[PDB]
């Protein structure tokens, strides 16, 4: 071992998961089409917005219902998530913005709501065994994504920003230091450790922490099938499909992270097989989920192939660079996901001739 990337440094903290220069230059000087229009986010006064408050003390996700898994929901629950749903909305929305616009109140407005976390000592005391363990990855993420865009911004209270990245460091260092179990030390829950851990390592500057993410998606490579399914996301039943979609997010972002680092993860393989295979294979059992009963008998839940779906986002980007065919036909509408960096339509979509 340990693995191949374990000397990878990074290069530039402010190289972000886009080139965010020339992609603000494009999108105002390139020829649109009416997708790439339906993207661009709409401004607003964000120096007046209410942001959540972050939880004080223990960070405690409710159950969702009161007895079982039918009932009624827990009146309790809906407000925490709301509380972590609004945060990532905002945040992936305010860095969405400072790319297409390169006004730095949105940096401003950003900075001051995630200063308002590191205050509190948000996403840093909680049961590793709860969903609080999932949930801070998922936040973690979304909120550096869109601060790493911002990273080169002269304009701000640059001893906020600061606070802020180290705040985001410790959190990162903290929730990735838990191993996990039999199958979240290993599965789709390790990649999104990978993309928290890559994209927090480059805005902070911390190389063990950038090589500890790289190092998921290594993992990743050695637990795809001949014939390009993820070894761990086929034993899910009924949502064995919706899985190896979703592990597609976080690879993806952790090679698009990567790639500004100068590192080419697309090209890593083992066995012969790489991101490309596991690609075909979403797309293959998609319009043949036959493919699928190799695995599973259950029918598959298809609820994530349906247009505007935040779960498609990964497209975007691996399109944007491999030039690949829409297949499906799901590229339609704009796609939007905080946790993959906002609207990969935004970032990363180019019009065909």
Same mark, same amino acid.
């Given at each position: 071992?340990?693995?191949?990337?374990?000397?990878?440094?990074? +290069?530039?903290?402010?190289?972000s998961?886009?080139?965010?220069?020339?992609?603000?230059?494009?999108?105002?000087?390139?020829?649109?089409?009416?997708?790439?229009?339906?993207?661009?986010?709409?401004?607003?006064?964000?120096?007046t917005?209410?942001?959540?408050?972050?939880?004080?003390?223990?960070m405690?996700?409710?159950?969702?219902?009161?007895?079982?898994?039918?009932?009624?929901?827990?009146?309790?629950?809906?407000?925490?998530?709301?509380?972590?749903?609004?945060?990532?909305?905002?945040?992936?929305?305010?860095?969405? &913005?400072?790319?297409?616009?390169? +006004?730095?109140?949105?940096?401003?407005?950003?900075?001051?709501?995630?200063?308002?976390?590191?205050?509190?000592?948000?996403?840093?005391?909680?049961?590793?065994?709860?969903?609080?363990?999932?949930?801070?990855?998922?936040?973690?993420?979304?909120a550096?994504?869109?601060?790493?865009?911002?990273?080169a911004?002269?304009?701000?209270d640059t001893?906020?920003?600061?606070?802020?990245?180290?705040?985001?460091?410790?959190?990162?260092?903290?929730?990735?230091?838990?191993? /996990?179990g039999?199958?979240?030390?290993?599965?789709?829950?390790?990649?999104?450790? /990978?993309?928290?851990?890559?994209?927090?390592?480059?805005?902070?500057?911390?190389?063990?922490?950038?090589?500890?993410?790289?190092?998921?998606?290594?993992q990743?490579?050695?637990?795809?099938?001949?014939?390009?399914?993820?070894?761990?996301?086929?034993?899910?039943?009924?949502?064995?499909?919706?899985?190896?979609?979703?592990?597609? &997010?976080?690879?993806?972002?952790?090679?698009?992270?990567?790639?500004?680092?100068?590192?080419?993860?697309?090209?890593?393989?083992?066995?012969?097989?790489?991101?490309?295979?596991?690609?075909?294979?979403?797309?293959?059992?998609?319009?043949?989920?036959?493919?699928?009963?190799?695995?599973?008998?259950?029918?598959?839940?298809?609820?994530?192939? +349906?247009?505007?779906?935040?779960? &498609?986002?990964?497209?975007?980007?691996?399109?944007?660079?491999?030039?690949?065919?829409?297949?499906?036909?799901?590229?339609?509408?704009?796609?939007?996901?905080?946790?993959?960096?906002?609207?990969?339509?935004? &970032?990363?979509?180019?019009?065909?001739?």
């Amino acid at each position: 071992g340990s693995h191949p990337f374990d000397q990878a440094v990074v +290069k530039d903290p402010t190289a972000s998961y886009v080139d965010v220069k020339a992609r603000r230059t494009f999108l105002q000087s390139g020829q649109l089409d009416d997708r790439l229009k339906a993207a661009l986010p709409k401004e607003y006064d964000c120096t007046t917005e209410a942001t959540p408050n972050p939880q004080q003390g223990e960070m405690v996700i409710p159950r969702r219902y009161l007895s079982g898994n039918h009932g009624p929901v827990n009146p309790d629950y809906e407000p925490v998530v709301t509380l972590y749903r609004d945060f990532e909305k905002i945040s992936a929305t305010l860095g969405n &913005l400072y790319v297409a616009t390169g +006004k730095p109140v949105y940096a401003t407005c950003l900075l001051n709501m995630l200063d308002k976390w590191a205050k509190a000592d948000a996403l840093l005391n909680y049961d590793p065994k709860s969903q609080s363990w999932y949930q801070v990855e998922w936040s973690a993420a979304t909120a550096a994504f869109a601060l790493s865009t911002m990273m080169a911004e002269p304009n701000v209270d640059t001893a906020q920003r600061e606070r802020v990245v180290k705040w985001l460091n410790r959190v990162a260092r903290h929730q990735t230091s838990f191993p /996990g179990g039999d199958t979240s030390c290993c599965n789709n829950a390790s990649y999104w450790r /990978g993309q928290e851990a890559t994209i927090i390592g480059v805005i902070s500057k911390d190389d063990e922490l950038f090589r500890w993410g790289l190092g998921r998606y290594v993992q990743a490579m050695g637990l795809i099938n001949e014939d390009g399914s993820f070894v761990h996301e086929m034993t899910r039943h009924e949502q064995s499909l919706h899985y190896q979609n979703y592990a597609m &997010l976080p690879l993806t972002m952790i090679a698009e992270t990567a790639s500004r680092q100068g590192i080419d993860l697309y090209a890593y393989k083992e066995n012969g097989r790489d991101i490309h295979s596991a690609r075909k294979f979403v797309f293959a059992a998609v319009k043949n989920p036959d493919l699928i009963k190799k695995y599973a008998s259950e029918p598959q839940d298809t609820r994530a192939f +349906k247009p505007g779906r935040g779960d &498609l986002n990964w497209i975007e980007y691996q399109r944007a660079r491999f030039g690949f065919a829409d297949e499906l036909g799901f590229m339609t509408v704009p796609i939007f996901d905080p946790r993959t960096g906002g609207s990969g339509t935004l &970032l990363a979509y180019k019009p065909q001739g």
